[PDB]
């Protein structure tokens, strides 16, 4: 029962349209619980989960001002990169960032990360050790010296190993009825005859949480991965996801190919079949 | 850098004509963030647009979900019209209940 806590930051420069747009969103696993948009009536860290709005006013002030300031640090960071790369003033550039902590089944941290990307391509990431840096290009190496002398990687190790865990833990105990409630997938098989012998047999998996799911088709135990089309896992909207896998099977052979589902919500993996 | 979005138009719950349902349009994989997305009822734009908050993937590509409550019928045709900096002309993707 391994979980996670990640924070997403988007800072896109819009020259002429005033000042850049900052959109920072907080997630626990696949559950969106906090958000901040720079362009808002009065910008503040907003609750998106019932367990997070339970937290006190002094919490909401802290969280708000950090994002309010991050936006400004990002606004300057954009101008800094414009000099680094010697690029156009009028151009619209993107600054992406994501930091978070991956916690185990018994509450202790396994993976910590602080990676960021300029214009859609990786810039500088904090390595698994939580004490090292890897720069993508030569301009990413300027930030490296800056963050290796100011020991930025140390505080991050303290946050990720410390408070990141303490809070992901608080949040896990806070909204357990929505977070630790493993939703099993409501599955079934749909038959599409096509024409005569070749028929498409689709395997549906809807209403499951989290997004991690493995769907396969098997002809007498052999994986038909080469001849199976699989859609990317998509959100239904109601806190749950959906995904399908289909195979072209000739008529008569329809009662050989079996569908296989693997999910947290299931105790034993299901070997469901098409039944008229 | 410029990457075109990957559209997916599906329903929340299975196909049942007359039943109260939701029309989803999962646009993902696009870069930069600027994306114009509209949903359609028989080719006519639906004004009741409601979309998710801008999040990116581990490959740094963004993703948004434009959703609206709809009533599936037999004669009605529902599509989703996407437009991105990469897109030459607005990408209209029709909805299929078997997909």
């Amino acid at each position: 029962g391994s979980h996670s806590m990640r924070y997403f930051h988007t800072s896109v420069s819009r020259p002429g349209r005033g000042e850049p747009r900052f959109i920072t969103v907080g997630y626990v696993d696949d559950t969106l619980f906090v958000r901040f948009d720079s362009d808002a009536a009065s910008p503040r860290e907003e609750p998106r989960a019932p367990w997070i709005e339970q937290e006190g006013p002094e919490y909401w002030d802290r969280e708000t001002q950090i994002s309010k300031a991050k936006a400004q640090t990002d606004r300057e960071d954009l101008r800094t990169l414009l000099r680094y790369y010697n690029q156009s003033e009028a151009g619209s550039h993107t600054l992406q960032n994501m930091y978070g902590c991956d916690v185990g089944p018994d509450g202790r941290l396994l993976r910590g990360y602080h990676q960021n990307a300029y214009d859609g391509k990786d810039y500088i990431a904090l390595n698994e050790d939580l004490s090292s840096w890897t720069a993508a290009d030569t301009a990413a190496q300027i930030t490296q010296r800056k963050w290796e002398a100011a020991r930025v990687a140390e505080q991050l190790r303290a946050y990720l190993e410390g408070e990141c865990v303490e809070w992901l833990r608080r949040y896990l105990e806070n909204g357990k009825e929505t977070l630790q409630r493993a939703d099993p997938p409501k599955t079934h098989v749909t038959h599409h005859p096509i024409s005569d012998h070749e028929a498409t047999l689709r395997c549906w998996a809807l209403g499951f949480y989290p997004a991690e799911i493995t769907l396969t088709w098997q002809r007498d135990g052999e994986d038909q991965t080469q001849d199976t089309e699989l859609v990317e896992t998509r959100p239904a909207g109601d806190r749950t996801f959906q995904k399908w896998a289909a195979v072209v099977v000739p008529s008569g052979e329809e009662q050989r190919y079996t569908c296989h589902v693997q999910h947290e919500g299931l105790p034993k993996p299901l070997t469901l079949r098409w039944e008229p | 850098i410029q990457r075109t979005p990957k559209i997916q138009v599906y329903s929340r719950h299975p196909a049942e004509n007359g039943k109260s349902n939701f029309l989803n349009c999962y646009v993902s994989g696009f870069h930069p963030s600027d994306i114009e997305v509209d949903l359609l009822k028989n080719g006519e734009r639906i004004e009741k647009v409601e979309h998710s908050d801008l999040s990116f993937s581990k490959d740094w590509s963004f993703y948004l979900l434009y959703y609206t409550e709809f009533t599936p019928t037999e004669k009605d045709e529902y599509a989703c019209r996407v437009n991105h900096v990469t897109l030459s002309q607005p990408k209209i993707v029709k909805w299929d209940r078997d997909m």
Partner: antibody, heavy 119, light 109 residues
Framework: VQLKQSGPGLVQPSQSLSLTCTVS????????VHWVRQPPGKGLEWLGV???????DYNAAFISRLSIRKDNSKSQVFFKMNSLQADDTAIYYC??????????????WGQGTLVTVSA | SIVMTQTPKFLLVSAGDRVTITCKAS??????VAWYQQKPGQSPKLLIY???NRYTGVPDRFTGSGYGTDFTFTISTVQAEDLAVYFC??????????FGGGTKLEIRR
């Protein structure tokens, strides 16, 4: 970090080309594997990619006949191209950019599979 | 779909020379260019990335430059090992990401 390719080296006209690119040193569920061909003595041509999540991008001139699918557990990525012809005779490499990003500059490449469209 | 024009198609020079290649894009690409070395019977190997950045393990003799439309690749010291077909690439556009024609590096002895 390696990409081991395997598949038939001769295809009869109007038939498919099923290829397999077996990866290692990295997880499939994270990175994206591309497919780029090279006609003998000619330039390079990017044909398609399969992303981390199972999403795909195909070179438009190929979209109907092309199909890339992957088995994350078995570290394999398959490339099936239907109804081959003389213009498709080339070496097929599977490639990857240095990081998880949707970048197209290829740090790592396969050894290539020489395919010959002939009766 | 940005046409990348590679010049010259052929390049013959003696050892210890400074040779230049030019890849010109039909449309602007904000430093999203790559440079490869394809030795016969072997795969193309990434020399440079992002126009000016040398890939890990690639020597100092191989240096790239340029931004937006004009892009050049220059070899500090030509060696017998450098013999190959040199290509360039674009990654700014949408998914079809073009390649240059190629530069056949022949040597004088």
């Amino acid at each position: 970090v390696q990409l081991k390719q395997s598949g038939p080296g001769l295809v009869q006209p109007s038939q498919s080309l099923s290829l397999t690119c077996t990866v290692s040193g990295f997880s499939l569920t994270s990175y994206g594997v591309h497919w780029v061909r090279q006609p003998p003595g000619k330039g390079l041509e990017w044909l398609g990619v399969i992303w981390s999540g199972g999403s795909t991008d195909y070179n438009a001139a190929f979209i109907s006949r092309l199909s890339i699918r992957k088995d994350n557990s078995k570290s394999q990525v398959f490339f099936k191209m239907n109804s081959l012809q003389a213009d498709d005779t080339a070496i097929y490499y599977c490639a990857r950019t240095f990081t998880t990003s949707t970048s197209a500059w290829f740090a790592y490449w396969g050894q290539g599979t020489l395919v010959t469209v002939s009766a | 779909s940005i046409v990348m024009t590679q010049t010259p198609k052929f390049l013959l020079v003696s050892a210890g020379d400074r040779v230049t290649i030019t890849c010109k894009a039909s449309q602007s690409v904000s430093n999203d260019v790559a440079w490869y070395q394809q030795k016969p019977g072997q795969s193309p190997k990434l020399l440079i990335y992002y126009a000016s950045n040398r890939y890990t393990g690639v020597p100092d003799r191989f240096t790239g430059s340029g931004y937006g439309t004009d892009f050049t690749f220059t070899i500090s010291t030509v060696q017998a090992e450098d013999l190959a077909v040199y290509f360039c690439q674009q990654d700014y556009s949408s998914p079809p990401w073009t390649f240059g024609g190629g530069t056949k590096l022949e040597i004088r002895r």
